[PDB]
């Protein structure tokens, strides 16, 4: 039976391939060739944030486009005031091996976690003024690779056990488990309307998950190796992924196909982080060459570079309003461009 | 009148920065160790000799060591291995001797040594279950490592008294199998410190203390151009 089920799966895969080919009347590169290029983009470092001792693994902008949370391998979260370069909080962690962090959309909570397989949620606004652990979420069997906040009482996480999860913070229990990946899940991205999210994994694939049902809606392939970063397009009908094959790809959720490939002959390093600008015209990606390339998302040309780090550039983000880009690397420095 | 908030923020920075300076003092004086090993490796025994990750702290002669043992992580190491790329050393525990587990250990040592992020991390290598190797050999290696049939013990070997020369050949052959990889790939940035340990041996902690010392010393000597 096992061989007949494998043949059935291959037949369904062939049907999917044919259905996708049927819709490929034209490529993106054949439509946008009449669109003026963005030109040369020359961002400059405006502020550099110092205070971390170990390599920075995660950074996330708050919803006010003014505060940052960052996590190093020392076991310390720092809240920063991007405008005045001042620090706001410096949270010690139970364990130093933290791989992700997230800033709540309300600004009330900070989440983090890593190799301890536990997502720690810190309450930044307490009556005593001290930052305390409000919840420790446990149940994932692998390392925690990414955390995202839907609301103050709901967090979406991903781990190294090939499973994503939806957690109810107040009760501390897991409510939805998203399975179907075969490799570690590396990065999550939430839709602007936080009804869907997309999950990249160490399988050269990505999945579109429906938050409320727990079902996987689409599976996207096209990358050759492990996917390290994923980011929803501002519109919400597309996402960009980066992988270890030194390629970035734009996928469209409505055509269920790869839409554009961002690559260059001189890039043989992986893409640690991916993010879009407010308008979606620029795509920013961090690499292992200790820099960041700015791509024209509609043309796949390089618009500019962001140089100023001396070790691997692990994280990257853009403010909701769009005034600045923040990056962090393994040299323990967070730099802000504009 | 809004200046009072900026002043408050500066006060916050003063408090945070002072705490960070104290933490930096603790951080740089602490030596972090990653503990890896084979499925039958006595990693638990090594921890005893004194969630998703376990932490053990040691103070040896007023020097603080922080040893991390990989807990219930998935067997796919290629993603969380990158995290431990700035530890003082990686402690890799291999049991000597049903699959060819030793070849798996060699393939893992090979993968860890040649990693693009671990090129500046030394490896302290423990070869365990020496008495089981001794009993098995004196009672077969050629069925996994044919070149063992032509291997001879190095003249500068220092075996323990009472050992059967065939056991010394097996031990040094395995050590050499690891060292050939270590020497072939290394470019003076990191070194392997293989050791032959027993299931019960308290000297292991000293073996670690001294190996870490040697690592830091030769690192600095490399920086001063004296080595």
């Amino acid at each position, epitope marked *: 039976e096992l061989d007949q089920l*494998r043949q059935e799966a291959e037949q369904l895969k062939n049907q999917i391939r044919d259905a996708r080919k049927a819709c490929a009347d034209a490529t993106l590169s054949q439509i946008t060739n009449n669109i003026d290029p963005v030109g040369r983009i020359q961002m400059r470092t405006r502020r550099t944030l110092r205070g971390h001792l170990a390599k920075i693994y995660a950074m996330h902008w708050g919803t006010d486009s003014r505060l940052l949370v960052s996590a190093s391998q020392d076991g310390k979260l720092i809240i920063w005031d991007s405008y005045t370069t001042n620090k706001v909080h410096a949270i010690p962690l139970r364990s130093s091996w933290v791989m992700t962090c997230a800033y709540a959309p309300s600004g009330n909570y900070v989440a983090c976690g890593g190799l301890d397989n536990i997502c720690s949620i810190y309450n930044l606004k307490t009556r005593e003024g001290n930052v305390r652990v409000s919840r420790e979420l446990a149940g994932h069997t692998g390392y925690l690779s990414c955390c995202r906040f839907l609301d103050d009482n709901q967090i979406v996480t991903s781990s190294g056990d*090939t499973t994503c999860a939806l957690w109810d913070i107040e009760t501390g229990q897991q409510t939805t488990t998203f399975t179907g990946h*075969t*490799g570690d899940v590396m990065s999550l991205s939430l839709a602007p309307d936080t009804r869907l999210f997309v999950s990249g994994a*160490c*399988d*050269a*694939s990505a999945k579109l998950w429906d938050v409320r049902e727990g079902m996987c809606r689409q599976t996207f*392939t*096209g990358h*050759e*190796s*492990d996917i390290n970063a994923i980011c929803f397009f501002p519109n919400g009908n597309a996402f960009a992924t980066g992988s*270890d*094959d*030194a390629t970035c790809r734009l996928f469209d959720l409505r055509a269920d196909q790869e839409l554009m490939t961002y690559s260059h002959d001189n890039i*043989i390093c*992986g893409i640690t982080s991916v993010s879009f600008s407010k308008s979606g015209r620029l795509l920013l990606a961090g690499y292992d060459d200790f820099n960041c390339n700015v791509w024209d998302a509609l043309k796949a040309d390089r618009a500019g570079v962001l140089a100023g780090h001396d070790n691997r550039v692990s994280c990257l983000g853009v403010t909701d309003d769009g005034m600045a880009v923040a990056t962090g690397s393994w040299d323990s420095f967070l730099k802000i461009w504009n | 009148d809004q200046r009072n908030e900026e002043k408050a923020q500066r006060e916050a920075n003063k408090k945070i920065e002072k705490q960070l300076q104290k933490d930096k003092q603790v951080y740089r004086a602490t030596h972090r160790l990653l503990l890896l090993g084979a499925g039958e490796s006595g990693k638990n025994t090594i921890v005893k000799q004194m969630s998703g990750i376990f932490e053990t702290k040691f103070q040896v002669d007023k020097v603080n060591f922080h040893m991390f043992d990989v807990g219930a992580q*998935r*067997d*796919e*190491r*290629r993603k969380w291995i990158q995290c431990f790329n700035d530890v003082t050393a990686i402690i890799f525990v291999v049991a000597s001797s*049903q*699959t*060819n587990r030793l*070849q*798996a250990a060699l*393939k*893992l040592f*090979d*993968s*860890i*040594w*040649n*990693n*693009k992020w671990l090129r500046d991390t030394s490896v302290i290598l423990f070869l365990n279950k020496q008495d089981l190797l001794a009993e098995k050999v004196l009672a077969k290696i050629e*069925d*996994y*490592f*044919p*070149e063992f049939a032509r291997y001879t013990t190095p003249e500068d070997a220092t075996p323990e008294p009472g050992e059967d020369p065939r056991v010394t050949r097996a031990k040094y052959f395995i050590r050499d199998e690891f060292l050939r990889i270590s020497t072939a*790939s290394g470019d003076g940035r990191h070194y392997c410190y293989p050791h032959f340990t027993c299931a019960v041996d308290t000297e292991n902690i000293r073996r670690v203390f001294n190996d870490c010392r040697d690592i830091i010393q030769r690192m600095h000597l490399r920086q001063y151009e004296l080595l």
Partner: nanobody
Amino acid sequence: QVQLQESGGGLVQPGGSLRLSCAASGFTFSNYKMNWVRQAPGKGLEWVSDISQSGASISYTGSVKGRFTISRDNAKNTLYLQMNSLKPEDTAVYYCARCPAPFTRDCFDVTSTTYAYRGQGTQVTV
């Protein structure tokens, strides 16, 4: 999407020989190291052979040296395995496996848990 499909299996008597193959799709074959691994009927996956991107460096487990050879063809994206002088100990499911990251000298790909860049395997009974 990336696929590895092994072929050339079957049953032979001790002392016989087989030629195994592996067809790759969905990735640039010449940029990755390739491996052969075996799954014994009652034992966990074991690494067998490792050929570099160019074929300039070939490694074998000691139990197969002098009996097995491997090669690759970058113009066809095909990985082979010549299995000579076979013994009963060689009965196993053989899988074609690719190291996870391109231009890398280190790879973790003999994991018991589902490895993404591995084929379905072919049964080689001796």
